[PDB]
Amino acid sequence: ATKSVLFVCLGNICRSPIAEAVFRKLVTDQNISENWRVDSAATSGYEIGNPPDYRGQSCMKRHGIPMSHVARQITKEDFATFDYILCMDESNLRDLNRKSNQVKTCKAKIELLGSYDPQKQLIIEDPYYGNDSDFETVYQQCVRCCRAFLEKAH
Numbered sequence: 151a152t153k154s155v156l157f158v159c160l161g162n163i164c165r166s167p168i169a170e171a172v173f174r175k176l177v178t179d180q181n182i183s184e185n186w187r188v189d190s191a192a193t194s195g196y197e198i199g200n201p202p203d204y205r206g207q208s209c210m211k212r213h214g215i216p217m218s219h220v221a222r223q224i225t226k227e228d229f230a231t232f233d234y235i236l237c238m239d240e241s242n243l244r245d246l247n248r249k250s251n252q253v254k255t256c257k258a259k260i261e262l263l264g265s266y267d268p269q270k271q272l273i274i275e276d277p278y279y280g281n282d283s284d285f286e287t288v289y290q291q292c293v294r295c296c297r298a299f300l301e302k303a304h
């Protein structure tokens with residue numbers, strides 16, 4: 151059976167496209183991309199249609215992680231179709247839980263991506279107002295969390 155994961159942040163231009171790209175690389179490396187549906191989306195509509203933040207794209211290039219994405223807003227359908235919805239921070243979690251209670255079918259388990267970190271860094275902090283080093287921190291956290299999630303989901 152196909153497995154599926156949706157990574158979510160507020161705008162779907164910084165953290166969530168990086169998480170999605172990291173995870174897709176991990177499954178592709180293990181020959182199992184065809185067994186996974188992997189995507190990312192936004193809780194809000196501010197950035198719909200936009201490519202990832204140029205600073206995040208630069209970071210991904212440096213690390214050889216394939217990334218190609220158009221920002222989109224989460225839909226009611228996503229709650230019915232995804233097995234996991236993994237978000238970045240407490241604001242995202244509060245918003246997603248609100249949305250989940252407005253649909254009839256919520257198949258998805260909604261969790262913080264950082265709850266999977268073996269190094270126990272719960273929040274993947276928003277790098278929007280940060281610098282290149284903050285994007286690097288986000289990348290490194292995503293690697294740790296995505297590896298652990300792939301290994302064993304909650």
Ligand SMILES: O=C(O)Cc1cccc2ccccc12
Nearest residue numbers: 224225226248249250252253
């Ligand atoms: O943000 C809201 O509460 C309304 C709302 C906006 C956009 C997508 C949604 C998906 C599921 C449930 C509600 C949703």
